[PDB]
Amino acid sequence: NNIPSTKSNTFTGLVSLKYLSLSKTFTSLQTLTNETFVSLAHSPLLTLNLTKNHISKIANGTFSWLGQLRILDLGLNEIEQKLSGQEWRGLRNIFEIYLSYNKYLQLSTSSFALVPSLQRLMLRRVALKNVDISPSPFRPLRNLTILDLSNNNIANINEDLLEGLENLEI
RNA sequence: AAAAAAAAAAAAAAAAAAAAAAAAAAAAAAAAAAAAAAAAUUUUUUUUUUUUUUUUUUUUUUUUUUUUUUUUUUUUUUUUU
Ligand SMILES: *[C@@H]1O[C@H](CO)[C@@H](O[C@@H]2O[C@H](CO)[C@@H](O[C@@H]3O[C@H](CO)[C@@H](O)[C@H](O)[C@@H]3O)[C@H](O)[C@H]2NC(C)=O)[C@H](O)[C@H]1NC(C)=O
Numbered sequence: 727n728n729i730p731s732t733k734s735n736t737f738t739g740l741v742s743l744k745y746l747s748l749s750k751t752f753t754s755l756q757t758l759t760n761e762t763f764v765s766l767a768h769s770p771l772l773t774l775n776l777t778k779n780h781i782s783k784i785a786n787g788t789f790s791w792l793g794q795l796r797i798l799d800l801g802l803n804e805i806e807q808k809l810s811g812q813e814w815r816g817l818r819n820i821f822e823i824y825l826s827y828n829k830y831l832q833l834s835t836s837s838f839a840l841v842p843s844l845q846r847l848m849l850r851r852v853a854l855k856n857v858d859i860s861p862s863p864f865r866p867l868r869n870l871t872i873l874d875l876s877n878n879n880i881a882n883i884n885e886d887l888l889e890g891l892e893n894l895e896i
Numbered sequence: 897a898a899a900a901a902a903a904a905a906a907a908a909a910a911a912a913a914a915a916a917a918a919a920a921a922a923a924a925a926a927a928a929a930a931a932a933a934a935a936a937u938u939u940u941u942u943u944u945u946u947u948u949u950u951u952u953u954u955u956u957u958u959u960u961u962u963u964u965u966u967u968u969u970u971u972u973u974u975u976u977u
């Protein structure tokens with residue numbers, strides 16, 4: 727679709743919505759603030775698609791009202807910012823994150839502290855840098871099953887990465 | 897009472913010379929010191945600009961294999977009004 731951007735009460739009224747897809751829908755959406763998905767406060771979403779939406783910036787607490795959201799997609803996007811953990815604020819029971827196909831995703835030791843209940847995490851060709859810092863960004867995470875960091879050309883790695891991750895399988 | 901000549905001693909003061917020294921100031925010569933400015937041999941460290949080798953990410957180009965839709969060039973055996 728070709729909607730430029732959403733409004734304050736665009737999705738207001740959906741009290742039972744759980745499957746929402748917005749792939750290749752937004753063209754004027756360059757920066758994601760915490761006033762875009764305010765309409766989905768009462769919507770118990772479970773899946774979310776946001777591929778090909780030309781998303782380049784997300785603000786702190788953007789998905790704060792997405793407490794019941796479990797699956798969200800952010801692949802095939804132009805995200806260029808610093809991950810500090812507050813981008814996933816408000817995610818009570820999150821399942822997995824589609825965060826592949828990007829151009830720059832800087833990671834820090836607190837980039838994933840807020841959400842410790844992840845199951846799958848793929849970072850395919852997102853050009854990740856500066857990961858070998860101690861402690862590892864994945865210290866709070868324990869329930870991951872699939873971890874993909876392929877096609878990223880990691881500069882360095884140390885022992886602190888991927889230690890104690892008992893639940894990993896892939 | 898006073899005045900003078902040969903001849904021998906002693907006391908105050910002034911101007912001198914020589915010798916034995918001792919202090920203050922001034923000149924060098926040696927043995928050291930503390931430094932603010934200096935140069936010169938050796939081994940290392942930071943930063944800027946660039947050289948060589950190896951491993952990989954993005955994009956572009958060539959060749960080969962395979963798959964899906966359209967323009968279709970044809971057809972053999974039949975059907976057909
Ligand atoms: C959002 O919508 C898009 C478009 O429908 C969904 O894309 C689909 O994603 C799946 C899984 O990533 C793709 O399946 C995989 O395809 C690859 C080839 O690209 C294949 O090698 C794998 O084995 C697997 O079959 C699927 O092809 C793809 N479809 C399209 C049309 O792109 C996406 O999954 C949606 N996201 C969410 C969270 O709903």
Ligand SMILES: *[C@@H]1O[C@H](CO)[C@@H](O[C@@H]2O[C@H](CO)[C@@H](O[C@@H]3O[C@H](CO)[C@@H](O)[C@H](O)[C@@H]3O)[C@H](O)[C@H]2NC(C)=O)[C@H](O)[C@H]1NC(C)=O
Binds near residue numbers: 760785786
């Ligand atoms: C959505 O994102 C915006 C942008 O970051 C957030 O605005 C920021 O909110 C914080 C917290 O209120 C502000 O910091 C503090 O605000 C209080 C307000 O009383 C003030 O007294 C403090 O001195 C301090 O400034 C911050 O200034 C503000 N920045 C901007 C540019 O608006 C907003 O809070 C976020 N909303 C949600 C629901 O996450």
Ligand SMILES: *[C@@H]1O[C@H](CO)[C@@H](O[C@@H]2O[C@H](CO)[C@@H](O[C@@H]3O[C@H](CO)[C@@H](O)[C@H](O)[C@@H]3O)[C@H](O)[C@H]2NC(C)=O)[C@H](O)[C@H]1NC(C)=O
Binds near residue numbers: 785786810811812
């Ligand atoms: C979104 O949340 C992150 C936190 O996850 C915010 O980053 C935080 O920003 C503050 C303010 O700059 C930082 O405090 C100061 O940081 C400097 C270094 O930049 C440090 O020298 C100071 O002593 C002080 O701690 C804080 O460290 C930083 N935290 C992280 C984890 O990066 C970010 O500002 C928020 N953005 C918005 C728009 O609300």
Ligand SMILES: *[C@@H]1O[C@H](CO)[C@@H](O[C@@H]2O[C@H](CO)[C@@H](O)[C@H](O)[C@H]2NC(C)=O)[C@H](O)[C@H]1NC(C)=O
Binds near residue numbers: 842843869
């Ligand atoms: C990590 O995964 C485990 C296993 O799925 C979670 O343990 C389950 O948690 C749910 C909800 O709290 C309970 O209903 C189940 O009975 C638990 N199962 C077991 C075997 O313990 C655990 O909660 C997850 N951790 C986090 C932080 O989400």
